[PDB]
Design a protein around this nucleic acid. Structure first.
Length: 138
DNA sequence: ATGTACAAACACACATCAAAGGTTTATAGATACATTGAAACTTTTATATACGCGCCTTTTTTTTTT
């Protein structure tokens, strides 16, 4: 966690699974340890980071990533709490925007590359195949 | 005349002393287990809250011999 602290506190945010890949922490000993730790400094006293690191993991040009910052922020800004650990609803912006482009990143390839449920995608994409109205920049 | 068994030098052949060193092993360093008690550890639950995932469980599709 002090890494996840040290990471996020250094303005680089990584998912719990990502560190879990580095160290298997039973995903639970992580959580309780984090809460105290954060409050350790508070007494001693940001999911945006995920959009680009994902695009590169798929090897995409900047525009597809460029757009998602607008889309995810705009999808976040109005409504759609949408997600229970917004890690997922980040990726759907790529999926939203990758389909706005025509580049083969077929859902199955997305999943294992980013180790995400496929179900959260399409249902997450439900709120997108309907919200396709206001993301028109050009 | 006359040299011979006998025992003293007189410098030496002979038994002794002494440094060195492999080998053995208690003896100890360090070693790897063997003990155990002790506290750091596990469990319910239900309880809604809002998740999945796999597995309970099932419906629809899928496949060899006479």
């Amino acid at each position: 966690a002090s890494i996840l602290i040290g990471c996020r506190r250094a303005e680089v945010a990584r998912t719990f699974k990502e560190i879990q890949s580095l160290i298997h922490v039973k995903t639970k000993e992580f959580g309780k340890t984090l809460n105290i730790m954060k409050n350790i400094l508070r007494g001693k006293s940001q999911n945006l980071t995920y959009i680009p690191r994902f695009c590169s993991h798929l090897g995409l040009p900047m525009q597809v990533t460029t757009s998602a910052e607008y889309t995810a922020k705009k999808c976040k800004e109005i409504k759609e709490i949408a997600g229970k650990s917004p890690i997922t609803i980040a990726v759907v912006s790529i999926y939203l925007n990758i389909l706005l482009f025509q580049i083969p990143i077929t859902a199955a390839k997305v999943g294992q590359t980013l180790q995400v449920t496929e179900g959260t995608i399409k249902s997450g994409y439900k709120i997108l195949y309907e919200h396709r109205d206001k993301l028109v920049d050009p």
